Amino acid sequence: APPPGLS
Amino acid sequence: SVESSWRYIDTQGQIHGPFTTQMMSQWYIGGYFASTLQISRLGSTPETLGINDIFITLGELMTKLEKYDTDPFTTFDKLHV
Numbered sequence: 001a002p003p004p005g006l007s
Numbered sequence: 008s009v010e011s012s013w014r015y016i017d018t019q020g021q022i023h024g025p026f027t028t029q030m031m032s033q034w035y036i037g038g039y040f041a042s043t044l045q046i047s048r049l050g051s052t053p054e055t056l057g058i059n060d061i062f063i064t065l066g067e068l069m070t071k072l073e074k075y076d077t078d079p080f081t082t083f084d085k086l087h088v
Contacts, residue, residue: 003026005017006044007013 009052011084016045025049027078035078041067048083050053056087 013031014024015069034040042065050059063071068079075082 002037003015004023005019005021005041006041007040 009084009088011088012049012081013080014047014052015040016050028084031080032078035080040065042069052088054083056083058083063087 011028012025013028014022014026016022031046040046045062045067046065046068047060047062048054048058053059058068058071065079067073068083072079072082072086076085
């Protein structure tokens with residue numbers, strides 16, 4: 001599951 | 008035995024963290040981090056690479072280590088903490 005603030 | 012805490016700056020310039028080496032490792036292995044991502048090791052303990060509390064790109068962290076195993080974060084703690 002992705003790190004906050006990065007997509 | 009110490010584990011590092013890390014921060015990073017997103018593209019909107021917001022600072023996220025502190026996140027542990029293990030967490031950072033997982034995200035790295037997940038393929039979530041760009042080499043241009045600005046990251047920082049928090050100066051919680053001494054360390055031999057010389058990166059405490061500075062902001063450098065992930066790509067630059069790796070040029071400094073000159074070798075990584077599964078990820079630069081785990082490598083750092085193993086080799087420099």
